[PDB]
Curated annotation (Swiss-Prot), chain A:
UniProt miscellaneous comment: Present with 1500 molecules/cell in log phase SD medium.
Tree of life domain: Eukaryota
Function summary: Required for activity of HDA1 histone deacetylase complex. The HDA1 histone deacetylase complex is responsible for the deacetylation of lysine residues on the N-terminal part of the core histones (H2A, H2B, H3 and H4). Histone deacetylation gives a tag for epigenetic repression and plays an important role in transcriptional regulation, cell cycle progression and developmental events.
Compartments in which it is found: Nucleus
Organism: Saccharomyces cerevisiae (strain ATCC 204508 / S288c)
Family: Belongs to the HDA2/3 family. HDA2 subfamily.
Assembly, per entry: Heterodimer with HDA3. Component of the HDA1 histone deacetylase complex composed of at least one HDA1 homodimer and one HDA2/HDA3 heterodimer. Interacts with HDA1 and HDA3.
Protein name: HDA1 complex subunit 2
Signal peptide start-end: none
From Swiss-Prot, chain B:
Chain's gene name: HDA1
Function: Responsible for the deacetylation of lysine residues on the N-terminal part of the core histones (H2A, H2B, H3 and H4). Histone deacetylation gives a tag for epigenetic repression and plays an important role in transcriptional regulation, cell cycle progression and developmental events. Histone deacetylases act via the formation of large multiprotein complexes.
Name this protein carries in UniProt: Histone deacetylase HDA1
Family per similarity comment: Belongs to the histone deacetylase family. HD type 2 subfamily.
Location(s), subcellular: Nucleus
Lineage: superkingdom: Eukaryota
Range of the intact protein held here: 29 to 76 of 706
UniProt miscellaneous comment: Present with 3050 molecules/cell in log phase SD medium.
Cysteine disulfide links: none
Length: 48, 48
């Protein structure tokens, strides 16, 4: 029972770590996609 | 080498018999408390 318990507890730990990881990576690509959208605005003024 | 050279060609008599060493510290071990069930309590990340 403590075998299965500690497997599930390490699983829960790895889960919380992974949620941190995905929101981290997403939060960093936010500013990237923002700047990319701004250059797109510049490029559209260029087209016009 | 030395001439001090204690000459006594006989069996001796037991003087102080071997006893259990009269120490109160460290024939024992160190106590250790561990349990995966105190990794139990978790937070609910709710804000974001």
């Amino acid at each position: 029972k403590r075998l299965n318990e500690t497997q599930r507890q390490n699983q829960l730990d790895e889960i919380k770590n992974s949620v941190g990881l995905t929101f981290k990576k997403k939060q960093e690509v936010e500013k990237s996609i923002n700047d990319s959208e701004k250059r797109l605005k510049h490029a559209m003024t260029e087209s016009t | 080498e030395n001439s001090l050279s204690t000459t006594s060609k006989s069996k001796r008599q037991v003087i102080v018999p071997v006893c259990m060493p009269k120490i109160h510290y460290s024939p024992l071990k160190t106590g250790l408390c561990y349990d995966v069930r105190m990794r139990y309590h978790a937070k609910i990340f709710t804000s974001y």
